[PDB]
Ligand binder design. Structure first.
Ligand SMILES: [Zn+2]
Length: 396
């Protein structure tokens, strides 16, 4: 599942003492980005015309070019992002709600792109249509899950995306509070039916499995609830979210990895979607909000599991691959300024410079943001500037 990580750890260099990446490594990274960009452009020509998702479709490619534009300021990239959103803005049936897999991705990415190209009316039309998803999400009688790829938390992300990328006052805080309350009541309900009201106040399941991790599980729901832009009150944070965070912490393996769901006792997946590379963001965010060192210390422990098991044979992607796990190191570095994690991110990036020379399997969507090439390009573009790195479709 993982390669043997060949690199020595930081103690046993691709940056200077002050944290700045050396010229040679920047140049090697920018060279590969150009290289991979052209392979991605070529392969997307045969990709599925209908998958418009941020996760595996066209909206994800526009997200990459938005990201390229954020970090280079090259207007060429802004314009190219428009080429990819435009594919996605016409078919919308409003049956999927999340930023990653539903209509909120095309719509929120489109609204941001239009706003940076100064056309306010198309920008506003996107936002207006996005908010029409509101009732389907807030309805407690809907079978809709709460998790990030198909549930309330993924819709919540789109709103926070608008208020952080465009600005506060794009989405009404009333509409964010409604979605937050819907998520909270959902977690109270299931936790009562499972008689966990006092041990895990907020409990969630997806397809009747109580997933632990970022993509479909509790760690990603708690992570969004802890976002400063979701404006959750102190009482709900300390009485409802923190004890739920602590409950999942105590389900961790002795190996330091985290299970895929509460029942599963076999330690296999070291992915953003399942395992320590996703749960670590819950812990790091828990450290930002609650400021107790045990949360950071556990994030550091997650980092060591990811350093040893995180170079994956699945591939180089964000969801379950080397780029997504490499982001764990950039995030922890931003939090700690401990250049050990800068080093570890730099080494995973080095692995990505050899993209496709390792005998990794080919993902179904091999050019996509979260399954394929676009995500690796995304991750490489952020190692250039570790201080401003953002995990796509997840950090704000
Ligand atoms: Zn995955």
């Amino acid at each position: 599942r993982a390669f043997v990580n060949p690199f020595p750890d930081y103690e046993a260099l691709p940056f200077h003492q002050d944290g700045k990446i050396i010229h040679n490594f920047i140049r090697r990274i920018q060279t590969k980005i150009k290289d991979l960009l052209q392979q991605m452009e070529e392969g997307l020509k045969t990709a599925d015309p209908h998958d418009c998702s941020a996760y595996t479709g066209w909206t994800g490619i526009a997200l990459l070019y938005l990201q390229l534009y954020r970090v280079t300021c090259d207007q060429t990239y802004l314009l190219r992002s428009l080429d990819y959103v435009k594919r996605t803005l016409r078919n919308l049936n409003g049956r999927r709600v999340t930023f990653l897999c539903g209509d909120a991705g095309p719509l929120a990415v489109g609204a941001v792109i239009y706003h940076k190209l100064r056309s306010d009316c198309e920008s506003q039309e996107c936002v207006t249509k996005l908010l029409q998803l509101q009732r389907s999400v807030v309805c407690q009688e809907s079978d809709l899950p709460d998790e990030l790829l198909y549930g309330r938390a993924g819709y919540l992300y789109a709103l926070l995306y608008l208020n952080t990328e465009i600005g506060p006052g794009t989405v009404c805080e009333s509409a964010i509070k409604e979605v937050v309350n819907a998520i909270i009541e959902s977690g109270k309900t299931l936790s009562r039916e499972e008689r966990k009201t006092e041990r895990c106040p907020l409990l969630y399941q997806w397809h009747r499995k109580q997933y632990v991790g970022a993509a479909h599980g509790m760690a990603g729901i708690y992570y969004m609830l802890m976002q400063p832009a979701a404006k959750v009150d102190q009482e709900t944070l300390t009485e409802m979210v923190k004890p739920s965070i602590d409950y999942v912490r105590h389900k961790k393996f002795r190996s330091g990895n985290y299970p895929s769901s509460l029942s599963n006792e076999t330690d296999r997946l070291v992915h953003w979607c399942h395992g320590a590379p996703g749960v670590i963001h819950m812990l790091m965010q828990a450290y930002k909000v609650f400021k107790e060192e045990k949360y950071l210390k556990e994030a550091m422990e997650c980092s060591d599991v990811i350093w040893q098991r995180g170079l994956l044979r699945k591939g180089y992607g964000i969801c379950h691959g080397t780029a997504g796990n490499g982001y764990s190191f950039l995030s922890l570095y931003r939090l700690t300024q401990d250049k050990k994690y800068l080093y570890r991110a730099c080494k995973f990036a080095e692995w990505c410079l050899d993209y496709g020379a390792h005998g990794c399997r080919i993902p179904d969507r091999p050019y996509s943001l979260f399954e394929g090439m676009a995500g690796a390009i995304h991750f490489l573009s952020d190692v250039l500037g570790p201080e401003t790195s953002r995990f796509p479709a997840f950090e704000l």
